[PDB]
């Protein structure tokens, strides 16, 4: 069995939001429902990461560290893919019972956050990204940041990261293009991977603010609350080494 097929088989199931369509829409209602759903997406992300070949061999501390950094990169990219497979859109397919449409985008403060998510699905569409390439890219996003001093199992991590970089390369060759275009596609796809760092930084600005401002009454589940509580001090003390393909 191929390494890419092993990443395919562990693709998490589609979760429903539990959004009652009969009651009218509001930004607060939608944002609250999405945070609660986000916690359930992140609980499934732990199960997902554990089944990625090589991940369970890293020190337990490194496993926690990687999921804590990458949480938003994983969710924005997976949503971007899900929304791109239901395109031409212009829509964010958060769950089958909760799709952010053009009318939902008009709601106060909705667009300002949605636009960073819409950039991801627009890029996968523009570059006509395949399933195999996507699977390789999502695993590479779990391994896109490390602490300032590095990981406990850094050597093993660098070995695992190189392995999945090579896996991405195999999915590019399959598109049957000449080596000049093969270099072009890799440059293009790894540029989107690098640009995820900015998408996340933009999404986390409004997310950290809604979490810290208790007067906004915007609830986060225990799983999301725990990640944000851990991440805020690390971004504050500069304890993050964002890995870049292009300099």
């Amino acid at each position: 069995p191929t390494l890419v097929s092993l990443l395919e088989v562990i693709e998490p199931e589609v979760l429903y939001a539990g959004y009652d369509s009969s009651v009218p829409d509001s930004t607060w209602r939608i944002m609250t429902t999405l945070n609660m759903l986000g916690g359930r997406q992140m609980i499934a992300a732990v199960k997902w990461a554990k089944a990625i070949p090589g991940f369970r061999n890293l020190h337990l501390d490194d496993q926690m560290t990687l999921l804590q950094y990458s949480w938003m990169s994983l969710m924005a990219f997976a949503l971007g893919w899900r929304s791109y497979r239901q395109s031409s859109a212009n829509l964010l397919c958060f769950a089958p019972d909760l799709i952010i449409n053009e009318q939902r985008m008009t709601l106060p403060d909705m667009y300002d956050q949605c636009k960073h998510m819409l950039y991801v699905s627009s890029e996968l569409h523009r570059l006509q990204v395949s399933y195999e390439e996507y699977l390789c890219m999502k695993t590479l996003l779990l391994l896109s940041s490390v602490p300032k001093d590095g990981l406990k199992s850094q050597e093993l991590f660098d070995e695992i990261r190189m392995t999945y970089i090579k896996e991405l390369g195999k999915a590019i060759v399959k598109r049957e293009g000449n080596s000049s275009q093969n270099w072009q596609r890799f440059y293009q796809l790894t540029k989107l991977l690098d640009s995820m760092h900015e998408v996340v930084e933009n999404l986390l600005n409004y997310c950290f603010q809604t979490f810290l401002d208790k007067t906004m009454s915007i609830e986060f589940p225990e799983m999301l609350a725990e990640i944000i509580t851990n991440q805020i001090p690390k971004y504050s003390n500069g304890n993050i080494k964002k890995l870049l393909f292009h300099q």
């Binding site: 609980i43 732990v46 089944a51 926690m64 999921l67 804590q68 725990e226 509580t229 851990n230």
Partner: peptide, 13 residues
């Protein structure tokens, strides 16, 4: 510190 995440990684799925 990060009780829920450590539990989810340590437990058998």
């Amino acid at each position: 510190e990060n009780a829920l995440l450590r539990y989810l990684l340590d437990k058998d799925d």
